[model samples]
Target: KTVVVTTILESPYVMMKKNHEMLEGNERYEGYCVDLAAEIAKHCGFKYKLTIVGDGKYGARDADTKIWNGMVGELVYGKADIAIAPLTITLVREEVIDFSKPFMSLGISIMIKKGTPIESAEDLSKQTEIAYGTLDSGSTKEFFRRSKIAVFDKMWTYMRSAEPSVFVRTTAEGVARVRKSKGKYAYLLESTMNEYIEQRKPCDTMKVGGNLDSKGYGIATPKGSSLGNAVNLAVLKLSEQGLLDKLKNKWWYDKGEC
Candidate 1:
C-alpha cells in the first residue's frame, strides 16, 4: 500500500520551499518532516508520499461531541496511513491512535515580546494587566487551561471566558498579538516554536520561563496498523546512525541569519 502521510505546513517541520511556486508535487515542500517521511519509508518497507492536513490544525477532540478532528481525524477515520510531523504525544490522542517512539522531545513555553516584565506562568497568571493565552486549539493550550499545576489553574478562568478572547488561531497570529499589545499579552506554545521565532530577523519576541510539560513528538498511525510498530523500528535504525540528531541540526541550527 502507498503510505499516505498527513502533516501540517508549520515551518521547520513541513513547508513550501522558497521556490515552491516554480515546483510541483512534493518538490514544493521541505524541512524535517519531509526528510522524516523518506526515512520512515526507506526502512519500513513502504512507499510513502507527503501531504499537508486539509485543515491547518493539529487536531483536538471537542469534549461535547467526543469526535476527533485535524490530523487525528484523518487517522481515526482511515483517511491517511500515517502522520509525520511535530504532533505532540498526549494520553487523549494516544487512545485513538498509535504513536512511534520518542523521535524528539519538547515542552510548552511562554512567548512574550521583548521588554516585558513578566517572567513566568506565575507572573502572568496573577496579573490582569498582561493578557495571556495559548494556541486556540491543541494540547499546549489544553494543558495550561486546565491542569494539575496550580500556577496554570490560576489563569484557567480568564482564558476560558475572557472578553476579546485570549486564545489566537495560529502561532503567527499569536505573535502579532504580542507584537501589537505593547507588552500587554503573552502567548504560550511549543518551546521549539518559541525558540525558532526568537532567532529570526527582528526577533523581538522571546521564550520565558521553563516548559510547563514535556513529551515526545511521535509518528502516528491508525490504532491497529503494522506501520506503527514498523515506524518505531525504523526510527531506532536511524537513531542508531544519528540520523535524528543530524536532521534536527539540518533544519534548526542551520538557520536564518542566526
Candidate 2:
C-alpha cells in the first residue's frame, strides 16, 4: 500500500528545487528529509507520496478546541499516514502520535544579523536595545512561554506583551525580520535552521552562542499505526550505519553557499 507522507518546506529539510515550478509531485522538492524519506521507503519496501501540510503549521493543539493542527493533525485526523518533517518531539505531541527515535539532534539557538552585539539569551534578556522573537506556532516559542528558568521566563514575559507583537508566523519570516531589522531584531529558533541560514547566500547572519536547550527531530505517525514499527526500526538501522550523517552533510554543507 502507498503511504501518504506529510512534510514541511523547511530549508535543508524539505525545500523546493531551483526549477521546482517545472516539476511534478514528489519531484518538486528536495532536502535532508526528502532523501531520508526515500531511504525509509526503500528499507521498508513501501511506496509513498509526499504531501505538504495544507495549514503550513508544524503541529500544535488548540487549547480551547483541543484540536490538533498541521502535520500532526493530518495524521491524527487520518489525512496523512506519516510525517517526515523537522517536527520536534515534545511530550504534548507524543501523546497524540508515535515518533520514530530521533533522526537528527538540535536545540534552540539564536539567529542574528552579522555583527549584532548579543552573545547569548542572557544578553538579549538583559537589554532592551534588540528586539527578538520566535516562530509563533513552533516549539521554540512554546519553550520560552513555558520555561521556568530565570532568563527564559523573563524573556517570555516581554515577548508575550511586547507592542508590535514580536511573534512571527514562519521561520523564513523570522529570518527575514532579522536581516531587515538592522541589528535591532534577532530570531530565536532551532540550531538546525540557524546553521542552514548561516550557510546560505549573502550570509550576513550568524548563529550566536551555545544552544539554549537540547532535543531531536523525529518522524511522526498516528498512534498504533501499523507502519510505525517498521519506520522506527528503519531509523535505528540508518543511524547505526551513519546514513543520517551522510544525508546531513549532503544537504547542509556539500551544497552550502557560505
Candidate 3:
C-alpha cells in the first residue's frame, strides 16, 4: 500500500532541485526527513508518495477564520497519510492530531538585524523603537500568545495589533523583514532556522536571547493512523544509529545557510 506523505519546501529540511522532474522518490527527497521516511517505509513494509503541502504557511489557528495551515490541516482533513515537516508539537495541534516521538528538538528564538541593540526578547519588549512579530500563524507566534511571562505577555499585545503587513507569511518573509527593517524590526522563529540564517552571506541577522520555550519536531499522523507507531520507532532507530545527526550535519553544517 502507498502512504501519501505531505511535506513542504522549507530549506535545509526540504528543497526542490532544478532537475527534480527527473528524480524518483528515493532520489528526490533525500534530505533528513525524506531519508528518515524512506527508512521508516523499509521497516514498515510500505510504499509511499512524497507530496508537498498545498499551502506554504506553517500550520496554526487562524484567529479570525478559524482554520489551520501546513500539514496540520492536511492530517486533520485526511489529505495525507503522514507529515514529515519540521512541525513543532503544540498543545493546540495535539487536540486535532497525534505526533510521534520528536525526531528533532528546537526552541523559539528571536532573529534581529546585525548591530540591533536588542539582545533578547526582553530587550525588544522594553523598547518601542524596535518592533517584532512572528509568522502570522506559526508555532512561535502562538508561543507568545499563550505565554504568561511579563515580557512575552507584553510582546503578544503588540504583535496581535501590529499592521497586517508586518505579519509575515513565511520564514523567508520574516527573515527579509528583519533585513529590510534596518534594525527597527525583529522576527521570532525556530532556533534551528534562526541559527541557520546567521551563517549566510551578508549575514545581517543573529539569533539573540536564549530559547523562549522548548519543543520537538514530530512526524504527525491523524489520531488513529497505524503508521504513527512505526514512524516513531524509525525516528528513534535513526537517532540511535546516528543517522539523524549525520543528516543534520549534511544539511545544515555542510550546505551553509540552506
Candidate 4:
C-alpha cells in the first residue's frame, strides 16, 4: 500500500509551482519537503502519496471535545499514514503522536514590516499601537498560552483578549497582515518562515529580535507506528550526509526574490 503522507502548503516547505495547473499528483508541488520526501521514501524503501492536511493547521487538541485537529488528527484518526511537514516537536504533541528527530531547527520569532519601530518583544509588550498576533492552532500560540515568563505571559494576555482577535488562521495571513498594517501589526511565527518571508518579494517584512525559544521541526507518525523507526533513522542519516542542509539552502535561499 502506498503510504499516505500528510503535509501543509507552507512556502519553501510544500508549495504549488507557478504552473501547477499543468502538473499532476506530486508534480503539482515542490520545495524542501518535496525533496526530503523523495529522499526519505528512497531510504525507507516505501512509495508514498503527498497529501496536504485538510484543515491547513499544524496540529492542536481541542479543549472541549478533546479531539486533535490538523495533521495530528489525520494520524490519530487513521486518515493518513505518515506526516511529512514543518510540524514542530512539542511535549503536548509528543504525548499523542511520535515525532522523528528534528529535521530543521527554529524558534518563535517576531515578523514586522520594515521600520515598524520595534526591536524586541519587550517593546511590543510595552506598546499598544502596534498590534501583534500569532498563527492560531500552532505551537507558537501554545507557547504564549503556557509560558510563565513575565514578557510572554503579559503578551499572551493581550493577544487572547485583543479586539478583533490577534490570532491568524495561517502564516500567509499573518504575514499579509504585517505587510498591510503599515507598521501597525507584528506577527509572531517560526523563525524559519520569518526568515523565508524576509527574502521574498514585496520584501517589506523583517524578523526582529532573537528567537523566544529554540526547537526543531520533525516528521511525525501515529504513536508506535512501524514507519517511525525507519523514518527516525533516515532523518539522522540525512543530517549526517548534509542532505537536509542542502535542501534548506535549495528552497529558502536559491530562489529568494529579494
Task: Tell me the whole-model lDDT of each prediction, alpha carbons only.
Answer: 0.86, 0.93, 0.83, 0.95
Off by over 4 Å in 4: none
lDDT tens per residue, model 4, 130-150? 999998889999999999999
Q: Per-residue lDDT tens digits of candidate 2, residues 227-247?
A: 999999999999999999999
Q: What total of clashing residue pairs does each candidate reach?
A: 0, 0, 0, 0
- The candidate maximizing TM-score is 4
* Candidate 4 RMSD computed on C-alpha atoms after optimal superposition onto the true structure: 0.7
How high a TM-score does candidate 3 get?
Answer: 0.92
| TM-score of model 1 vs. true structure | 0.96
Model 1: CA > 4 A from native: none
- The prediction achieving the highest lDDT against the true structure is 4
The collision pairs in model 4 are: none
Which digits, one per residue and each the tens of the lDDT, describe model 1 over residues 207-227? Answer: 999988888899999999977
Model 3, 78: alpha-carbon shift in Å?
1.0
lDDT of 3 by residue, 101-193 (tens): 888889999898989998888898888888888886678877887889998999989878877555788888889889988899888889888
